[PDB]
Amino acid sequence: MLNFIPKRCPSVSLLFGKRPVQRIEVGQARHQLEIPVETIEKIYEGVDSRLEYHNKDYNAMKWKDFMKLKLDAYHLLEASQSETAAKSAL
Amino acid sequence: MLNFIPKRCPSVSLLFGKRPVQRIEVGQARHQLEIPVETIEKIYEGVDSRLEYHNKDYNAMKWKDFMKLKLDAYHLLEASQSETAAKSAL
Amino acid sequence: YATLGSGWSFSKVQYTKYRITKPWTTDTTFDDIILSQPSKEDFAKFTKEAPLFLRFLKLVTDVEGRQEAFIQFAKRCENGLTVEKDVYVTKKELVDCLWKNGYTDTEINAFEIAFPADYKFHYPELAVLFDLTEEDCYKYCIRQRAATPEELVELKYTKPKNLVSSYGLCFLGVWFGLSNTVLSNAWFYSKTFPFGAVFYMLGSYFYRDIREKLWKEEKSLIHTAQENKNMGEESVYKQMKKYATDTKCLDYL
Amino acid sequence: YATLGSGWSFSKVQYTKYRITKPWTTDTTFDDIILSQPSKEDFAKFTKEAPLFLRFLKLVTDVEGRQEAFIQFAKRCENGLTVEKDVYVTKKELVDCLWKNGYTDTEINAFEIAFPADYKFHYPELAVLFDLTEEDCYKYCIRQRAATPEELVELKYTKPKNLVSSYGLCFLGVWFGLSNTVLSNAWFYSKTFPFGAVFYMLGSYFYRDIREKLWKEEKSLIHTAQENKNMGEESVYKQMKKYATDTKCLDYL
Amino acid sequence: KTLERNVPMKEILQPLWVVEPPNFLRQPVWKQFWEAQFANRSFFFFGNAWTSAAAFAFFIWWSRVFDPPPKERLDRYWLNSPKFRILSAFHNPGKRPGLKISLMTYE
Amino acid sequence: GKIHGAVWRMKHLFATNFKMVGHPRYAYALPKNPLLQ
Amino acid sequence: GFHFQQYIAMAGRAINPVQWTRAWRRMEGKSATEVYRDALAWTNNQFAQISRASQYRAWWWQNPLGMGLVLYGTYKAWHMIYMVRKQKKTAQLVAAAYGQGGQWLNPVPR
Amino acid sequence: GFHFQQYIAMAGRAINPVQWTRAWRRMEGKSATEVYRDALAWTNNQFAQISRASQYRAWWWQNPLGMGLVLYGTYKAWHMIYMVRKQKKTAQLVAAAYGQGGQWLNPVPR
Ligand SMILES: CCCCCCCCCCCCCCCCCC(=O)OC[C@H](COP(=O)([O-])OCC(O)COP(=O)([O-])OC[C@@H](COC(=O)CCCCCCCCCCCCCCCCC)OC(=O)CCCCCCCCCCCCCCCCC)OC(=O)CCCCCCCCCCCCCCCCC
Ligand SMILES: CCCCCCCCCCCCCCCCCC(=O)OC[C@H](COP(=O)([O-])OCC(O)COP(=O)([O-])OC[C@@H](COC(=O)CCCCCCCCCCCCCCCCC)OC(=O)CCCCCCCCCCCCCCCCC)OC(=O)CCCCCCCCCCCCCCCCC
Ligand SMILES: CCCCCCCCCCCCCCCCCC(=O)OC[C@H](COP(=O)([O-])OCC(O)COP(=O)([O-])OC[C@@H](COC(=O)CCCCCCCCCCCCCCCCC)OC(=O)CCCCCCCCCCCCCCCCC)OC(=O)CCCCCCCCCCCCCCCCC
Ligand SMILES: CCCCCCCCCCCCCCCCCC(=O)OC[C@H](COP(=O)([O-])OCC(O)COP(=O)([O-])OC[C@@H](COC(=O)CCCCCCCCCCCCCCCCC)OC(=O)CCCCCCCCCCCCCCCCC)OC(=O)CCCCCCCCCCCCCCCCC
Ligand SMILES: CCCCCCCC/C=C/CCCCCCCC(=O)OC[C@H](COP(=O)(O)OCCN)OC(=O)CCCCCCC/C=C/CCCCCCCC
Ligand SMILES: CCCCCCCC/C=C/CCCCCCCC(=O)OC[C@H](COP(=O)(O)OCCN)OC(=O)CCCCCCC/C=C/CCCCCCCC
């Protein structure tokens, strides 16, 4: 994934927080996934506003947080690839 | 009206005599009118095949028959315009 | 060439400074049908999905009483129907034809509910569906496409031809046409560039005023003709409706 | 300018020898939005029919609890809504936005059943429907139109400018540029016309081979990137699904 | 049955004839010209009709004014003419016809 | 060109009238309408 | 106007000698009336294409003067390619026969 | 390339003297850095328009060589308009000072 976080201003992302939920399509099969808007808003605390790209519609996160996120993704992916993975995240 | 009779060949008028009825829209309001295909085919007895116009998709009638048709139309129209018209065509 | 179409809309076009663009293809090229005068082999081919049409065809054949045609067409069409791409008739045109030729409302509604609005029927489908010849269906489709020639048609791509001879002739042209003082003449600078530039500037500045002043009369004539047609048709229709009830005298007698 | 759009389709275009044509208009002209950089006053205006939208608006306002807005907008919009013509958002885009931002299936189905598929929402409609600012809605519509810039936008027609000075400068250009032996030179005939003509012929004959040989690598890279994205997303999703049932331990305890 | 013949477009789309203009009168030009003679103000070269222009042209052709000059009058204009000089030079490729022209004048 | 313009106007102004089967100055020669009385 | 490239290609094929043999073979069982009618039909097809397609289509060379500019350009190209070449030849001829300006000399004084 | 007509119009406005007074008034409360940044931004906007719109749009002058031909034409026009004019002036200067070819004469023999 890229470090491009869409601006939640209505001129860019119309209707961001009008409802308490976000939805996304995942993969080639386009599975649906719903995510709480608070879980999402947790990103805009690490978002950095000095940086703006792609027609000034996307900000960038701080590398610390972005790489923590990438590491969680990578851990999940390698666990999926492996077979001795733990049956729980506890 | 013009003396342009469409060719009933399927390369021109697809599905001419597949059914026993023809339909047309009339006027600005586009009233529907149904006409028997035999009443229509009566025209292709006066149609002249030597003459072909408009990409060779329309033949021309013989002037005698075409003008008889125009005269009937004109009589109906002037009767509609007049008020002393006969209440019946008998 | 004749101007085909059943529309009374007086339509003119204004041009841009950009060319028409189509998706990239390594084997096809888009062109105007009237300017190309293409043939069936010049047309490009593609594969179309059958099932949605084969279901309706099975229904129609079970109704009419001819299943050999359905079987043959299905065995021909399996793995998709290979057909010329830009030889088709739209659903709206087909429905208009059916209605004006006397097909029942049940059949028309079947067509409507069976096929999407943007479906495109090709000549083999038409032939197998109406028990006609593919030649006649092809000609009908071609006429209906020429009626709307603003849409480009897709042909097979062919390399240019006679490039070497054309290069020779163009070299000869420049060698004989630029070895002169024509583009540096007092005549040029005094008449050719001033008159031409003035005409170009006036045309660019009054491009639309001129067109409107010219087309005023044609627009008025077309309006008059359409109004006369409408009023006459309406009058005749209502008068025949008045006189429609003059046949029951006999069955009363 | 940035390349906006959410599509992964590697799209290239091939050109024709015909220009884009639009219906005749005495006051408007079609142009590219990025090349024109138009403003709100440069955009052309037109009147749109309200009722179909005003019904849905009344419903939404009765649901949300704000009827003053509906009353004001209806009194403003009566006799049609006067609005810029090519500043809109399509129904599909709006539905995608609603779905990804969390509007309920009931509301989405209401939108779908209420408006046709080819309906076009403008920024005043969006603002009055979502309690937003017309400025923000205008900017959003502009971004969504720039995402699809192949479609020309309709501006107010303006006469050409500076024609007299341009004529003077072009006369000066020809007077200084054609008073020479450049287009009749041995250098011309030996290098300029042969090299240029050979380049042109080779380009015309291998126009597509060159493009394909160049774009091969970019196509492969895009394919690889998309495959990696898909596989990673799927793996993460299925693993989180596996671990989704690790919260009930507490409520069991 | 299936279609295999390569159908040309000329069997479908017929082009209009525009090379030679239409004749809405459905009458030949000589008959038009003859009819104009009996119409008022269009007799032969009187009037301002096309037939009048055509008859005036034929009249000046039938006259003598446009015929070539006689040998007794050649040296008035023709022997000092650009057309004559250019033709003489062209048909005597590598020669100078000034002397022969002087002798033609003498003759 | 004059003839062309004349015919081009005659087309639009006559061919779709239903009232001009011929020219009005010669309507005396037309048959009589059986619907009038 | 249209198909100038096709016209150049036609001229090239015409000058190619092999095409001369091909045409010699094609002329077997053929009449002058047929040849003339075919050529006239080709020209009419070109002009009819123009008349029809100018109503709805615009070429890359479209301009506020339309096809008038393309026709003027055709004329000017013909002029500079043929007539000015003939003028050059005639100028050299006159300069070798009489001297420059020899065709505009005054008659010998009497 | 694009907007050549707009560029010609800009040159015309620039040479128009009234525009000189207009620019004199506009330069009130303005800095050289601002002027330079504005000009650089205008040039960048032109080139960015090109880079973006060449991906999906084709101009009337599109050809199998693309914008290379338009750029070559710009160069050739500049050449014939400015450099060949300067060459003509230099040629007349040299012909008046030394004679035709005077700048290529051999050194005086010793
Ligand atoms: C009265 C005084 C004056 C009298 C003197 C008159 C002098 C006349 C001279 C003769 C030339 C006439 C003008 C036409 C020229 C040809 C133009 C042409 O066709 O080019 C287009 C030709 C076609 O390509 P294209 O148009 O792009 O696309 C079409 C395809 O190619 C498809 O093309 P295609 O399918 O139609 O044909 C293909 C053909 C194309 O090849 C050619 O270029 C054709 C050249 C043929 C010349 C024949 C001259 C005949 C007259 C002279 C007699 C000589 C005796 C020989 C008799 C022939 C038997 C061997 O061959 C090939 O491409 C390769 C395959 C080979 C197959 C076999 C070909 C031979 C066929 C058998 C002979 C047929 C004879 C016909 C009977 C003629 C009766 C009158 O491409 C070329 O340009 C070829 C190169 C150009 C030739 C010159 C090469 C450079 C050398 C320059 C010479 C040196 C500079 C001068 C100094 C000389 C100092 C001494
Ligand atoms: C060191 C040794 C060398 C020293 C000597 C140097 C010699 C320099 C000579 C001066 C010329 C410089 C080159 C620029 C020329 C102007 C080019 C131009 O602007 O044309 C475009 C102009 C604009 O049209 P457009 O570009 O298509 O569209 C824009 C709109 O027009 C919209 O345009 P706009 O809104 O921007 O302006 C409109 C203006 C356009 O009218 C014009 O053409 C402007 C002409 C102004 C010339 C001023 C020359 C100043 C230098 C000489 C000083 C003379 C003392 C007078 C001082 C001025 C106070 C009265 O007027 C009008 O169109 C009509 C309304 C009138 C409103 C009032 C205008 C006057 C304003 C008050 C004066 C402002 C002075 C500014 C301070 C200057 C300080 C340096 O249209 C024209 O082409 C006008 C006709 C062209 C003029 C020539 C007419 C043919 C006569 C040829 C002369 C005879 C042949 C030569 C033989 C001579 C033998 C003696
Ligand atoms: C003389 C030529 C030789 C020049 C010197 C030798 C130099 C050799 C190097 C060549 C390098 C070329 C430079 C390439 C860089 C790119 C240039 C470019 O593409 O944009 C040019 C530029 C197009 O601007 P744009 O950014 O593409 O925007 C287009 C607009 O939106 C408008 O949109 P639109 O859709 O309405 O039209 C688009 C476009 C359409 O352009 C076309 O597609 C051409 C249309 C006809 C097709 C056939 C073309 C060739 C034969 C007819 C034209 C003859 C003139 C030669 C034109 C060469 C350019 C194709 O418009 C034009 O470009 C009009 C050009 C034709 C103007 C005719 C003026 C006649 C006065 C001269 C007397 C007649 C000719 C005398 C014989 C000359 C024989 C050499 O064309 C202009 O010149 C703008 C004129 C602005 C008004 C100025 C006041 C009127 C003065 C008229 C003369 C204007 C200067 C032209 C001088 C040539 C005539 C003497
Ligand atoms: C030198 C110019 C001065 C000439 C002498 C003075 C005469 C003055 C009177 C002018 C009268 C003009 C005649 C008007 C009648 C209508 C003509 C017409 O519109 O159709 C023409 C015709 C277009 O045919 P078409 O029926 O419209 O169908 C188009 C195709 O479908 C293809 O579709 P497409 O979409 O792919 O492309 C459409 C169109 C696109 O045309 C365009 O829009 C132009 C694109 C660039 C925009 C800027 C144009 C000006 C600056 C760049 C071009 C410089 C050359 C000047 C071109 C003038 C024409 C615009 O294609 C072309 O026309 C290509 C023309 C450019 C060929 C460049 C060859 C370079 C060799 C010479 C060295 C470089 C130049 C030296 C400096 C010369 C300075 C004067 O163009 C051709 O020449 C066909 C060539 C066929 C291959 C021949 C073998 C290669 C030989 C190359 C030279 C070909 C002859 C051109 C001589 C000029 C270069 C020396
Ligand atoms: C008078 C009633 C007729 C009125 C006109 C109605 C139209 C009649 C149509 C008749 C068709 C005749 C077609 C003639 C075809 C001509 C063929 C042709 O030209 O052959 C040559 C030959 C002429 O040869 P040249 O005399 O050598 O001329 C050489 C030029 N330098 O043709 C003729 O002879 C045509 C003769 C008729 C010429 C026209 C007569 C013009 C006379 C004008 C009226 C003169 C009035 C003078 C009255 C005198 C008052 C005191
Ligand atoms: C801008 C204003 C321009 C006006 C110029 C228009 C000039 C019009 C005058 C010409 C007509 C004058 C009538 C002369 C009749 C004289 C009496 C007469 O009948 O003599 C007959 C006599 C024929 O006799 P023969 O030669 O012996 O026949 C031998 C047969 N082989 O008629 C003639 O000679 C013909 C006279 C030719 C007149 C000169 C032609 C001039 C060319 C004019 C056409 C060019 C366009 C003119 C502009 C049009 C103005 C409307």
Side-chain angles (χ1 to χ4, degrees), chain A residues 18-32:
Chain A
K18 295 293 184 178
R19 256 54 169 173
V21 182
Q22 283 275 324
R23 308 201 180 93
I24 56 175
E25 284 165 330
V26 189
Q28 192 71 351
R30 302 176 74 73
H31 303 134
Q32 287 75 355

mmCIF file of all heavy atoms in Angstrom, chain A residues 18-32:
data_model
loop_
_atom_site.group_PDB
_atom_site.id
_atom_site.type_symbol
_atom_site.label_atom_id
_atom_site.label_comp_id
_atom_site.label_asym_id
_atom_site.label_seq_id
_atom_site.Cartn_x
_atom_site.Cartn_y
_atom_site.Cartn_z
ATOM 1 N N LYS A 18 -20.443 11.410 7.354
ATOM 2 C CA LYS A 18 -21.884 11.590 7.462
ATOM 3 C C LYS A 18 -22.543 10.383 8.110
ATOM 4 O O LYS A 18 -23.587 10.521 8.757
ATOM 5 C CB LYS A 18 -22.482 11.849 6.083
ATOM 6 C CG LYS A 18 -22.026 13.145 5.440
ATOM 7 C CD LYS A 18 -22.542 14.350 6.195
ATOM 8 C CE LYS A 18 -22.173 15.640 5.497
ATOM 9 N NZ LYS A 18 -22.723 16.828 6.204
ATOM 10 N N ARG A 19 -21.955 9.206 7.950
ATOM 11 C CA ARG A 19 -22.411 7.979 8.576
ATOM 12 C C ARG A 19 -21.293 7.376 9.416
ATOM 13 O O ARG A 19 -20.119 7.726 9.251
ATOM 14 C CB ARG A 19 -22.878 6.968 7.524
ATOM 15 C CG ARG A 19 -24.387 6.843 7.407
ATOM 16 C CD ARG A 19 -25.057 8.178 7.179
ATOM 17 N NE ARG A 19 -26.459 8.019 6.811
ATOM 18 C CZ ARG A 19 -27.317 9.024 6.687
ATOM 19 N NH1 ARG A 19 -26.924 10.270 6.910
ATOM 20 N NH2 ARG A 19 -28.575 8.783 6.346
ATOM 21 N N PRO A 20 -21.623 6.466 10.328
ATOM 22 C CA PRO A 20 -20.612 5.927 11.243
ATOM 23 C C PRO A 20 -19.842 4.730 10.708
ATOM 24 O O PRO A 20 -19.185 4.029 11.485
ATOM 25 C CB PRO A 20 -21.449 5.535 12.462
ATOM 26 C CG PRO A 20 -22.738 5.102 11.869
ATOM 27 C CD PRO A 20 -22.972 5.986 10.670
ATOM 28 N N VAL A 21 -19.903 4.473 9.403
ATOM 29 C CA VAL A 21 -19.310 3.272 8.831
ATOM 30 C C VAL A 21 -18.673 3.591 7.488
ATOM 31 O O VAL A 21 -19.110 4.488 6.764
ATOM 32 C CB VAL A 21 -20.356 2.150 8.672
ATOM 33 C CG1 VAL A 21 -19.712 0.899 8.125
ATOM 34 C CG2 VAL A 21 -21.028 1.867 9.997
ATOM 35 N N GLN A 22 -17.623 2.840 7.166
ATOM 36 C CA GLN A 22 -16.991 2.859 5.858
ATOM 37 C C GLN A 22 -17.043 1.460 5.262
ATOM 38 O O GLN A 22 -17.091 0.466 5.987
ATOM 39 C CB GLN A 22 -15.542 3.333 5.949
ATOM 40 C CG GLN A 22 -15.394 4.828 6.119
ATOM 41 C CD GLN A 22 -15.431 5.575 4.806
ATOM 42 O OE1 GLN A 22 -14.938 5.091 3.788
ATOM 43 N NE2 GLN A 22 -16.023 6.758 4.820
ATOM 44 N N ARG A 23 -17.036 1.385 3.935
ATOM 45 C CA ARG A 23 -17.096 0.114 3.230
ATOM 46 C C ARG A 23 -16.036 0.080 2.142
ATOM 47 O O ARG A 23 -15.675 1.112 1.571
ATOM 48 C CB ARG A 23 -18.473 -0.126 2.611
ATOM 49 C CG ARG A 23 -19.620 0.030 3.579
ATOM 50 C CD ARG A 23 -20.863 -0.681 3.090
ATOM 51 N NE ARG A 23 -21.976 -0.527 4.021
ATOM 52 C CZ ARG A 23 -22.902 0.422 3.944
ATOM 53 N NH1 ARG A 23 -22.872 1.320 2.973
ATOM 54 N NH2 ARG A 23 -23.869 0.470 4.846
ATOM 55 N N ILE A 24 -15.534 -1.121 1.860
ATOM 56 C CA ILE A 24 -14.495 -1.297 0.855
ATOM 57 C C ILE A 24 -14.673 -2.644 0.174
ATOM 58 O O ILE A 24 -15.218 -3.591 0.749
ATOM 59 C CB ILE A 24 -13.079 -1.189 1.464
ATOM 60 C CG1 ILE A 24 -12.910 -2.202 2.592
ATOM 61 C CG2 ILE A 24 -12.820 0.217 1.966
ATOM 62 C CD1 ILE A 24 -11.531 -2.248 3.143
ATOM 63 N N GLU A 25 -14.204 -2.716 -1.068
ATOM 64 C CA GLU A 25 -14.127 -3.953 -1.828
ATOM 65 C C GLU A 25 -12.686 -4.441 -1.850
ATOM 66 O O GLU A 25 -11.755 -3.657 -2.055
ATOM 67 C CB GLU A 25 -14.636 -3.750 -3.253
ATOM 68 C CG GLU A 25 -16.144 -3.673 -3.355
ATOM 69 C CD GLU A 25 -16.618 -3.124 -4.684
ATOM 70 O OE1 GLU A 25 -15.886 -2.313 -5.289
ATOM 71 O OE2 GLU A 25 -17.723 -3.503 -5.126
ATOM 72 N N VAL A 26 -12.509 -5.742 -1.646
ATOM 73 C CA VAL A 26 -11.203 -6.339 -1.410
ATOM 74 C C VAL A 26 -10.972 -7.441 -2.432
ATOM 75 O O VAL A 26 -11.845 -8.290 -2.646
ATOM 76 C CB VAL A 26 -11.096 -6.898 0.019
ATOM 77 C CG1 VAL A 26 -9.687 -7.323 0.317
ATOM 78 C CG2 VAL A 26 -11.557 -5.868 1.025
ATOM 79 N N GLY A 27 -9.799 -7.425 -3.058
ATOM 80 C CA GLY A 27 -9.375 -8.517 -3.906
ATOM 81 C C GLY A 27 -10.016 -8.504 -5.278
ATOM 82 O O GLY A 27 -10.757 -7.598 -5.661
ATOM 83 N N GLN A 28 -9.706 -9.556 -6.037
ATOM 84 C CA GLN A 28 -10.273 -9.703 -7.372
ATOM 85 C C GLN A 28 -11.754 -10.051 -7.303
ATOM 86 O O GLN A 28 -12.543 -9.607 -8.144
ATOM 87 C CB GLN A 28 -9.503 -10.772 -8.146
ATOM 88 C CG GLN A 28 -9.799 -10.814 -9.633
ATOM 89 C CD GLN A 28 -9.235 -9.619 -10.378
ATOM 90 O OE1 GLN A 28 -8.758 -8.663 -9.770
ATOM 91 N NE2 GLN A 28 -9.284 -9.673 -11.704
ATOM 92 N N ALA A 29 -12.147 -10.849 -6.310
ATOM 93 C CA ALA A 29 -13.552 -11.171 -6.107
ATOM 94 C C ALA A 29 -14.340 -10.004 -5.534
ATOM 95 O O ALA A 29 -15.575 -10.038 -5.564
ATOM 96 C CB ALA A 29 -13.677 -12.380 -5.182
ATOM 97 N N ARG A 30 -13.662 -8.985 -5.013
ATOM 98 C CA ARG A 30 -14.311 -7.782 -4.504
ATOM 99 C C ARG A 30 -15.238 -8.110 -3.335
ATOM 100 O O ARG A 30 -16.418 -7.757 -3.324
ATOM 101 C CB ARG A 30 -15.063 -7.059 -5.620
ATOM 102 C CG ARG A 30 -14.169 -6.666 -6.774
ATOM 103 C CD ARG A 30 -14.944 -6.044 -7.913
ATOM 104 N NE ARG A 30 -15.384 -4.688 -7.603
ATOM 105 C CZ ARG A 30 -14.574 -3.635 -7.554
ATOM 106 N NH1 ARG A 30 -13.276 -3.776 -7.781
ATOM 107 N NH2 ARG A 30 -15.062 -2.435 -7.268
ATOM 108 N N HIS A 31 -14.684 -8.798 -2.341
ATOM 109 C CA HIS A 31 -15.416 -9.053 -1.110
ATOM 110 C C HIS A 31 -15.687 -7.744 -0.387
ATOM 111 O O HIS A 31 -14.856 -6.833 -0.390
ATOM 112 C CB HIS A 31 -14.620 -9.990 -0.206
ATOM 113 C CG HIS A 31 -14.268 -11.293 -0.849
ATOM 114 N ND1 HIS A 31 -13.006 -11.842 -0.771
ATOM 115 C CD2 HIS A 31 -15.011 -12.158 -1.579
ATOM 116 C CE1 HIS A 31 -12.987 -12.988 -1.428
ATOM 117 N NE2 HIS A 31 -14.191 -13.203 -1.927
ATOM 118 N N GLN A 32 -16.856 -7.647 0.235
ATOM 119 C CA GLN A 32 -17.218 -6.447 0.971
ATOM 120 C C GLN A 32 -16.652 -6.501 2.382
ATOM 121 O O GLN A 32 -16.615 -7.561 3.012
ATOM 122 C CB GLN A 32 -18.736 -6.291 1.023
ATOM 123 C CG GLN A 32 -19.360 -5.863 -0.287
ATOM 124 C CD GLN A 32 -19.413 -6.979 -1.303
ATOM 125 O OE1 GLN A 32 -18.902 -8.074 -1.068
ATOM 126 N NE2 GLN A 32 -20.030 -6.708 -2.444
#
